[PDB]
Amino acid sequence: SVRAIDEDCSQYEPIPGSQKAALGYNILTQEDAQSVYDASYYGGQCETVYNGEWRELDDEKYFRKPYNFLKYHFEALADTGISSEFYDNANDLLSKVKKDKSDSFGVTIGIGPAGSPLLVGVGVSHSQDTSFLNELNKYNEKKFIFTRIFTKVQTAHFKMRKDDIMLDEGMLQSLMELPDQYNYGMYAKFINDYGTHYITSGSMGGIYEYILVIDKAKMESLXXXXXXXXXXXXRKAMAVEDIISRVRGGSSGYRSWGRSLKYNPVVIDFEMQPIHEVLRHTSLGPLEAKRQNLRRALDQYLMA
């Protein structure tokens, strides 16, 4: 709904996930970067989006959509990746989640249109993957038994503008300050601050990850635990090693995750373009020859 200039739009909270969708992304570190889109530009108008779930929490039921969002609407889609059950080792399980499993077993990134999506586990940084991993690994004798439950919820679909984007004020200042002549290091600094890539569409939502720790010889005496522990979702006996969990999106106040996710999402199942494409359309003439440099540096940066 478009309001009309005589309704105040300060009323409306910005659509959830708006700041996050505006950030660049680094394909190599799997880290987010600084803002690429201007997350708070409204283009002199009041565009609102309906939240049908408002009782669970006009003006209470509508959020404001920044201009750089061509589309945003809410969803509630749930994918449960209940695993395949057995697994001899933990690293094998987490590595084979990425390489060997379908898209409902994790989060995806894809480049461009026909750019087939890459499954990136949970979608944290490479250093965060090696902290959930290092702090996890420590637990076993000589690798016994691991199951995984993983749930993915999409709380919104969105699509970024392709034409006439409003670039973040700071990024535009950084661009304007790069030299006309090619200097790798300086453009590499730009890539580190703003990203390898920026998002053009995807989902808002989150992930809840479980990994059950089972004791071979145990189940022996007394797949089966996975089935049952999935019920516990929807310290005691039972070879209950210790259910380890990872979570993205939502906020405390933990299937309170489910209730709160829509209002505190992260970006998932997203499409992206190399950072330099951001300036290929979208106004700003003079700064073109800086795109060849930015392309060149990106190519070098990714060869690393």
Instruction: Give the binding site for Ni ion (CB under 5 A).
Output: 157
DSSP secondary structure, 160-224, as one string = E-SSS--B-HHHHHHHHTS-SS--HHHHHHHHHHH-SEEEEEEEEEEEEEEEEEE-HHHHHH--H
Beta-bridge partner residues of 79 = 152
Cβ nearer to Ni ion, comparing 165 with 204: 204
Q: How far apart are CA 235 and CA 63, in angstroms?
A: 42
Residue 109 CB, shortest distance to Ni ion, in Å, is: 19
Q: How far is the CB of 112 from Ni ion (least distance, A)?
A: 20
DSSP-derived letter for residue 30 is: -
Please state, in angstroms and rounded to a whole number, the distance separating the CA atoms of residues 145 and 135: 17
At its nearest, how many Å lie between Ni ion and the CB of residue 64?
19
- CB 201 to Ni ion: min, Å: 11
Q: Which is nearer to Ni ion, 157 or 246 (CB)?
A: 157
Question: Which is closer to Ni ion, CB of 20 or CB of 157?
Answer: 157
CB of 73 to Ni ion, least distance (A): 6
Phi, psi of 15 (to 5 degrees): -50, 140
**Least separation in angstroms between CB 286 and Ni ion:** 38
Q: Find the shortest distance in angstroms from Cβ 262 to Ni ion.
A: 14
Judged by beta carbon, residue 48 or residue 154, the one nearer Ni ion is 154
Is the Cβ–Cβ distance between 250 and 261 less than 8 Å? Answer: yes
Distances from the Cα of 4 to the Cα of 1, 48, 59, 60, 252, angstroms? 10, 11, 15, 18, 37
Shortest distance, CB of residue 71 to Ni ion, whole angstroms? 8
* Inter-CA distances, 224 with 81, 212, 227, Å: 16, 11, 5
Of the chain, the end-to-end C-alpha distance in Å amounts to 47
Amino acid found at 143: K
In the complex with Ni ion, the residue whose CB is nearer, 30 or 154, is 154
**52 vs 253 by CB, closer to Ni ion:** 52
DSSP secondary structure letter of residue 15: P
Looking at the Cβ atoms of 3 and 157, the one nearer to Ni ion is 157
CB 268 within 8 A of CB 203: yes
Q: Closest residue to Ni ion, Cβ-based?
A: 157
User: What is the C-alpha separation between 226 and 205, in angstroms, rounded?
Assistant: 24
Determine the Cα angle at 136 with ends 121 and 149, to 5°: 50
Given the complex with Ni ion, which of 71 and 255 has the nearer CB atom? 71
Collect all residues with Cβ–Cβ distance below 8 Å to 219 and sequence separation of at least 6. 145, 225, 239
